């Protein structure tokens, strides 16, 4: 972002399929707001697949090794879904979801900044590695059982090594190989419409953007509508903001890809 920091994220979702077979496992890899890998247990390849042109420049040993690690995750979280049933005294007939996020942050210079290692059961926090990458945050009495085990097995140290090591080494490499694509910005295209009015920012990357409304140079919060940033499908994003009574208002748009914050002439 404005820091110039870059981030690598791996997101995984496991949904149990009671009576319909083994759980569905989807894993996706993102560098900043650009996806580069994926793995779907329902797919026929049964191997980690590319989703960005600059990850194909990796060696063929990469795709074999990455496949082995994501498959281990899918098989590990399949037993964890069953352990959660015992911890929460839930039945084998219900569909449940286990989500995991892990990755690291580097700065503009490429030095290690932060690490992440969190779990969620049925969409709410289960356990997380704290920012010291040494202690755990357990959200309920079930996660306290897992936290004690992971403290006895010293899991934090094994993760802290990956987050500070293999994790950042990859992000650096992906950032350099994707220099023509990753270290760039797309300024928003601004335009305004009126209905008996709203500003539009289209085709911007990254997705970090702020749309502000000011009337006569004064911040306007009431009568204003702002929708969530949306993807267009081409790697860029879109967002709009809205507020007889007119001409006196102005829309102000801020984005790290804009030379100057934009002001919209109605």
């Amino acid at each position: 972002s404005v820091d110039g920091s870059h981030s690598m994220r791996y997101f995984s979702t496991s949904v149990s399929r009671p009576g319909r077979g083994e759980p569905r496992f989807i894993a996706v890899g993102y560098v900043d707001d650009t996806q580069f890998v994926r793995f779907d247990s329902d797919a026929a390849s049964q191997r980690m697949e590319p989703r960005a042109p600059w990850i194909e420049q990796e060696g063929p040993e990469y795709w074999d090794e990455e496949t082995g690690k994501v498959k281990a995750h899918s098989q590990t979280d399949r037993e964890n879904l069953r352990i959660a049933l015992r911890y929460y005294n839930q039945s084998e007939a219900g569909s449940h979801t286990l989500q995991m996020m892990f990755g690291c942050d580097v700065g503009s210079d490429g030095r290690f900044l932060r690490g992440y290692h969190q779990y969620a059961y049925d969409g709410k926090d289960y356990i997380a590695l704290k920012e010291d990458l040494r202690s755990w945050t357990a959200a309920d009495m079930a996660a306290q059982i897992t936290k004690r085990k992971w403290e006895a097995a010293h899991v934090a140290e094994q993760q802290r090594a990956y987050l500070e090591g293999t994790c950042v080494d990859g992000l650096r490499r992906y950032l350099e190989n994707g220099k023509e694509t990753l270290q760039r910005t797309d300024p928003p295209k601004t335009h305004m419409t009126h209905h008996p009015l709203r500003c539009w920012a289209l085709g911007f990357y990254p997705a970090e953007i702020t749309l502000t409304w000011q009337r006569d140079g004064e911040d306007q919060t009431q009568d204003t509508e702002l929708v969530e940033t949306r993807p267009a499908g081409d790697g860029t994003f879109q967002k709009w903001a809205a507020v007889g009574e007119e001409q006196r208002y102005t829309c102000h748009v801020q984005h790290e890809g804009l030379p100057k914050p934009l002001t919209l002439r109605w």
């Binding site: 995750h73 037993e79 352990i83 959660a84 097995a153 993760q159 994790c167």
Partner: peptide, 9 residues
């Protein structure tokens, strides 16, 4: 680079 160690709850 994915992680190489996965633990049980």
């Amino acid at each position: 680079n994915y992680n190489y160690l996965f633990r049980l709850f």
